[PDB]
RNA sequence: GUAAGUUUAGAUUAUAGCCAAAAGAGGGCUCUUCUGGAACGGAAAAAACCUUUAAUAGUGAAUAAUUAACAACA
């Protein structure tokens, strides 16, 4: 029930990011906005979702679009290393 | 006595729910944007553009 | 799925904003749809305690 | 899309048992699961509206076939 | 086109039926967004602090009375004044030190 | 004009659409085809955490591997002792789900848990509504309880 | 002054129409009734509280195997407001002692002597 | 020719259940909230009024 | 179809009811006679009308009663 980053501190997610994409050859991801409610008042909410030669990899939630795009990078990341939530659980079946 | 070995300490009082799940979704907790289809160029409603 | 826990909870209990058109539409019918939303009863996650409720704009 | 009574009454034509305490689970926690179960029951009611309008023996529909037991 | 909802918005819905008649199968992939379908972020002029603070603008009297300063914060968060007023002793120590916490 | 036309009209026609099924010869050949794709995806194992629908005791749990549940009654178990459960109504995955109408065959879907501890409930009040009332004319009733935890879901091409 | 009451003969003599809507020839007549109770017997004259207990039916919804005699009917004439009156049917025949453990009562009323829990195929 | 519209009516009604056989076969046990007269009268009076559509 | 009934021995309390629905009798009361009732659901609140075999734990399920009904000619 531990998600990665409250194991592993990294600031600046953004940064980690583009150098791993580099890696695989992958061009740098463009920064969008996928869906908006009241941005005018208080409480705000964005999603913003990182696209790839016009492909979709990330998208996330945010209070303010920073805010949001921090989160799509670190929801890529996940992706990227298979410690998404969704993952196929840990086994404690062997005996041996 | 034959109780008290199948016990564990855990105090005996109320408990709010029978079922406890720390991975409760698999596919993606809902919010009010799933389920509503997008627009060309992201324009809200009646904006000219 | 895999977001971070504030941003899951900041995102599902977010208000909307919708908008009405009333224009040779019977005052009742359009009540109806108002309260709906004003509540939160168009929300799988309602509940009386949770004030899930939604701005309207009618015209 | 769907009234209550219409989603209810037509997974219970299908042979599907769930109850009201789980389906309100799929719905907040499986999203993708819950729309599939929207379609069956949609697809089932159609089904009843084309066997009621026409009359005499046809074919009966794929999903309002009933297993049975012994 | 099978399937009788639209696949537009949440996922694409494939029913089938097995041989033997027992069993029903259901794929449903997800539904990406398409970049025609976005908006280009606004980097020109972000922390909410900041955001609340000039909504919270304090201009006349320095700091205002209470019921000036809660009218205010109504107004900004769509309540009633009557959220805002502080309570007595009697239901401030009546509160749980550590409420419980599920995951 | 044909025989039995009627000029359109508010009333003539039902507010309802009808609308046309697909034919029966080319649907079940699509079916074929998609439960061909769906086993192929469980014979490569391309699927994560895997969560179903259980009827147990006389209730339906929702369940996925690791899951606490909690019965409401003495069930003849020894501790740490590993069990089946045998009655499965639902399984899902990412992308694609099966249902059975109203129960999945034994070969599909295996559920194994295991039984943590055996205890009893809190004690509930009960104290009828009777004139004259008094403090002293009510019960206790506590229950005997189990606790098992979910271990594992697996499934097998053999749709 | 409310009082016991006699039904007239004649509703009890059945027409043509009914053999066909009900399905049952006029020969060779069923043999064991299925009888349950299907309202209460509160608000009702005592004579009719007797003979509810008399037949054994205080529980409602539960199912009661009584003989299709004169004597037994002129009984259920008088709670025939309360009760309905289902004819048992024996598809596989009577039970007998090798499959008097495998019985099992449908709601139409087919008493079955063998119960499997599988599909028909 | 008022009772001749009055045969009309009963033989034509569309009802299948009218207030005769009812009281007669105690269906309900109706019996219960009705009067001896009810027999007799089969539900065309009321006190000391005559109901002119009741068939 | 069904499980009570008589005899022997011992023992108090009670001896003013209430409303609904029938049939009468003195003319709205007042008596006499047969039936029913005393919800935690329903009829707006609701002793007396209607649904309701006892009483226990459960984040299961199928049902009962259920104040509403759809101004001319012909």
Excluded at chain 7, 9 to 27: A, L, R, T, W
Aim: hydrophobic share 35%; glycine share 6%; proline share 7%.
């Amino acid at each position: 029930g531990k998600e990665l980053f409250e194991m592993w501190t990294v600031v600046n997610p953004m940064g980690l990011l583009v150098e791993e994409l580099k890696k695989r050859n992958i061009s740098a991801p463009e920064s969008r906005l996928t869906r908006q409610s009241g941005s005018t008042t208080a409480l705000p909410l964005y999603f913003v979702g990182l696209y790839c030669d016009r492909k979709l990899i990330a998208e996330g939630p945010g209070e303010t679009v920073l805010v949001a795009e921090e989160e799509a990078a670190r929801v890529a990341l996940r992706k990227l290393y298979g410690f998404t939530e969704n993952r196929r659980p840990w086994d404690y079946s062997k005996p041996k | 006595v034959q109780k008290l070995a199948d016990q564990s300490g855990l105090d005996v009082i109320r408990i709010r729910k029978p079922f406890h799940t720390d991975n409760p979704s698999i596919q993606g907790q809902w919010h009010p944007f799933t389920n509503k289809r997008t627009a060309l160029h992201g324009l809200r409603p009646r904006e000219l553009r | 799925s895999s977001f971070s826990r504030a941003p899951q909870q900041w995102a599902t209990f977010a208000r909307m904003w919708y908008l009405l058109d009333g224009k040779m539409q019977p005052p009742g019918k359009l009540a109806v749809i108002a309260s709906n939303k004003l509540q939160g009863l168009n929300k799988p996650v309602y509940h009386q305690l949770s004030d899930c409720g939604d701005h309207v704009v009618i015209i | 899309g769907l009234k209550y009574p219409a989603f209810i009454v037509n997974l219970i034509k299908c042979q599907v048992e769930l109850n009201r305490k789980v389906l309100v689970d799929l719905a907040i926690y499986e999203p993708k699961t819950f729309k599939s179960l929207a379609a069956l029951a949609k697809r089932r009611q159609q089904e009843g509206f084309a066997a009621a309008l026409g009359d005499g023996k046809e074919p009966e529909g794929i999903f309002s076939r009933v297993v049975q037991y012994h | 086109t099978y399937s009788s909802l639209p696949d537009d918005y949440n996922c694409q819905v494939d029913l089938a039926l097995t041989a033997d008649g027992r069993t029903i199968v259901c794929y449903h992939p997800s539904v990406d967004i398409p970049y025609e379908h976005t908006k280009p972020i606004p980097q020109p002029d972000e922390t909410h602090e900041q955001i609340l603070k000039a909504k919270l603008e304090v201009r006349k009297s320095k700091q205002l009375e209470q019921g000036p300063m809660i009218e205010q914060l109504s107004k900004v968060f769509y309540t009633t004044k009557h959220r805002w007023y502080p309570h007595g002793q009697y239901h401030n120590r009546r509160k749980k030190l550590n409420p419980p916490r599920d995951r | 004009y044909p025989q039995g036309y009627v000029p359109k009209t508010s009333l003539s026609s039902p507010p309802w659409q009808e609308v046309v099924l697909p034919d029966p010869v080319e649907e079940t050949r699509h079916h074929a085809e998609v439960v061909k794709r769906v086993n192929e995806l469980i014979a490569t194992g391309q699927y994560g955490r895997l969560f179903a629908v259980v009827h147990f005791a006389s209730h339906q749990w929702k369940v996925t591997a690791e899951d606490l549940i909690l019965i409401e009654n003495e069930l003849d178990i020894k501790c740490g002792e590993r069990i089946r459960l045998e009655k499965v109504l639902l399984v899902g995955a990412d992308n694609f789900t099966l249902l059975g109408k109203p129960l999945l065959r034994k070969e599909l879907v295996r559920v194994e848990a295991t039984v943590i501890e055996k205890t009893e409930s809190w004690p509930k009040i009960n104290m009828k509504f009777r004139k004259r009332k008094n403090f002293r004319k009510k019960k206790i009733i506590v229950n005997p309880q189990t606790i098992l935890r979910i271990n594992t879901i697996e499934i097998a091409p053999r749709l | 002054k409310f009082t016991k009451s006699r039904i007239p003969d004649k509703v009890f003599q059945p027409k043509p129409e009914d053999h066909e809507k009900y399905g049952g020839d006029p020969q060779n007549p069923h043999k064991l009734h299925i009888v349950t109770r299907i309202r209460s017997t509160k608000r009702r004259p005592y004579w009719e509280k007797d003979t509810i207990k008399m037949l054994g039916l205080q529980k409602a919804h539960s199912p009661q195997i009584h003989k299709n005699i004169p004597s037994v009917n002129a009984k259920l004439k008088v709670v025939k407001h309360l009760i309905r009156i289902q004819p048992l049917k024996l598809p596989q025949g009577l039970p007998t002692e090798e499959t008097m453990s495998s019985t099992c009562l449908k709601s139409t009323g087919e008493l079955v002597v063998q119960w499997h829990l599988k599909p028909v195929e | 020719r008022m009772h001749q519209n009055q045969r009309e009516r009963e033989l034509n009604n569309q009802n299948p259940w009218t207030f005769e056989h009812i009281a007669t076969a105690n269906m309900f046990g109706i019996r219960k909230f009705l009067s001896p007269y009810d027999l007799t009268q089969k539900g065309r009076y009321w006190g000391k009024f005559y109901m002119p559509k009741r068939v």
